[PDB]
């Protein structure tokens, strides 16, 4: 039973002094890539930061030091928080590798992440040049 | 003309299914295949179409993910290491033939990073 306050603050989704832009690529990231992944049947555990209290995982944030989730990525894209598509792609990469680090190849959550990862790579193929 | 591609079947070769070989098809190859830079590596190097009269004068152990795919689907390998060697061959062939600045090399480097990330999790 994991106590209250065991979760770190979520990753920031706004920063007035960070330089940022809207680009054709970042707009495609929101309007095609994030949307396609969000609506997927396996998206839901990834739609918000991992809640180690609710999930009773006293080890999660002892192992994962660079948390990321699609809810954070969504808010970032909506807030035009990124300078370029690569910064956003790096957040997806973080989300996936975190899952693969914390969990075990047989786990349901891993099957879900592999599904979304393949979909992700497919949608990145048509990322505007 | 191009040489015949590498073999994907061989009745005399010792063969097994292992869980590691199944991981190589289901996770490693099937993730890599979807990557935006996978396409040049999905079939043998076509030296006629590419006008590379030196390619098969230099590369004598060609390999590609198309060959690897077929080999995994055909249960061609005895252990995961033979398949891993095929990937390593494909990558080093690219690095051998090309110059470090080349777009194909950056593509290769991206794919090899993903490949290593998946190999990291071999059971
Ligand atoms: C994603 C993710 N990355 O690391 C972990 C742990 C999760 C995770 C695993 C299992 C979860 C969740 C849930 C919400 C958010 C993150 C996670 C959640 O409800 N579960 C349950 C226990 C679950 C089990 C099996 C498949 C899907 C969800
Ligand atoms: C892979 C690979 N390994 O050695 C060579 C040469 C290649 C190769 C280089 C450039 C290619 C291809 C193509 C298909 C299959 C193999 C290769 C191909 O269409 N190109 C074009 C010319 C190309 C130029 C720059 C980046 C990617 C592809």
UniProtKB/Swiss-Prot annotation, chain B:
Residues 16-122 form the Bromo domain. The record marks 98 as: Acetylated histone binding. Chromatin reader protein that recognizes and binds acetylated histones and plays a key role in transmission of epigenetic memory across cell divisions and transcription regulation. Remains associated with acetylated chromatin throughout the entire cell cycle and provides epigenetic memory for postmitotic G1 gene transcription by preserving acetylated chromatin status and maintaining high-order chromatin structure. During interphase, plays a key role in regulating the transcription of signal-inducible genes by associating with the P-TEFb complex and recruiting it to promoters. It comes from the Eukaryota. Ubiquitously expressed. It is linked to Cornelia de Lange syndrome 6: A form of Cornelia de Lange syndrome, a clinically heterogeneous developmental disorder associated with malformations affecting multiple systems. It is characterized by facial dysmorphisms, abnormal hands and feet, growth delay, cognitive retardation, hirsutism, gastroesophageal dysfunction and cardiac, ophthalmologic and genitourinary anomalies. CDLS6 inheritance is autosomal dominant. A chromosomal aberration involving BRD4 is found in a rare, aggressive, and lethal carcinoma arising in midline organs of young people. Translocation t(15;19)(q14;p13) with NUTM1 which produces a BRD4-NUTM1 fusion protein. Interacts with p53/TP53; the interaction is direct. Interacts (via CTD region) with CDK9 and CCNT1, acting as an associated component of P-TEFb complex. Interacts with RELA (when acetylated at 'Lys-310'). Interacts (via NET domain) with NSD3, CHD4, BICRA and ATAD5. The interaction with BICRA bridges BRD4 to the GBAF complex. Interacts (via NET domain) with JMJD6 (via JmjC and N-terminal domains); the interaction is stronger in presence of ssRNA and recruits JMJD6 on distal enhancers. Interacts with NSD3. Interacts with NIPBL. (Microbial infection) Interacts with bovine papillomavirus type 1 regulatory protein E2. This interactions may serve for the tethering of viral genomes to host mitotic chromosomes allowing successful partitioning of the viral genome during cell division. There is a cross-link at residue 57 (Glycyl lysine isopeptide (Lys-Gly) (interchain with G-Cter in SUMO2)). Changing residue 103 to G: Found in a patient with a neurodevelopmental syndrome; uncertain significance. JQ1, a thieno-triazolo-1,4-diazepine derivative, and I-BET, a benzodiazepine derivative, have been tested on tumors with success. Treatment with GSK1210151A (I-BET151, a I-BET derivative) has strong effets on mixed lineage leukemia and promotes myeloid differentiation and leukemia stem-cell depletion. Phosphorylation by CK2 disrupt the intramolecular binding between the bromo domain 2 and the NPS region and promotes binding between the NPS and the BID regions, leading to activate the protein and promote binding to acetylated histones. In absence of phosphorylation, BRD4 does not localize to p53/TP53 target gene promoters, phosphorylation promoting recruitment to p53/TP53 target promoters. Belongs to the BET family. The NET domain mediates interaction with a number of chromatin proteins involved in transcription regulation (NSD3, JMJD6, CHD4, GLTSCR1 and ATAD5). The C-terminal (CTD) region mediates interaction and recruitment of CDK9 and CCNT1 subunits of the P-TEFb complex. It is also required for maintenance of higher-order chromatin structure. This is Bromodomain-containing protein 4. It is found in: Nucleus; Chromosome.
């Amino acid at each position: 039973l994991v106590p209250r306050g065991s979760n770190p603050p979520p990753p920031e989704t706004s920063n007035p002094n960070k330089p940022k832009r809207q680009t054709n690529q970042l707009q495609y990231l929101l309007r095609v890539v994030l949307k396609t992944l969000w609506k997927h049947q396996f998206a839901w555990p990834f739609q918000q930061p991992v809640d180690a209290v609710k999930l009773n995982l006293p080890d999660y944030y002892k192992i994962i030091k660079t948390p990321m989730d699609m809810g954070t990525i969504k808010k970032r894209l909506e807030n035009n928080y990124y300078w370029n598509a690569q910064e956003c792609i790096q957040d997806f990469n973080t989300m996936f590798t975190n899952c693969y680090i914390y969990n075990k190849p047989g786990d349901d959550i891993v099957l879900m992440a592999e599904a979304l990862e393949k979909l992700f790579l497919q949608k990145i193929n048509e990322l505007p040049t």
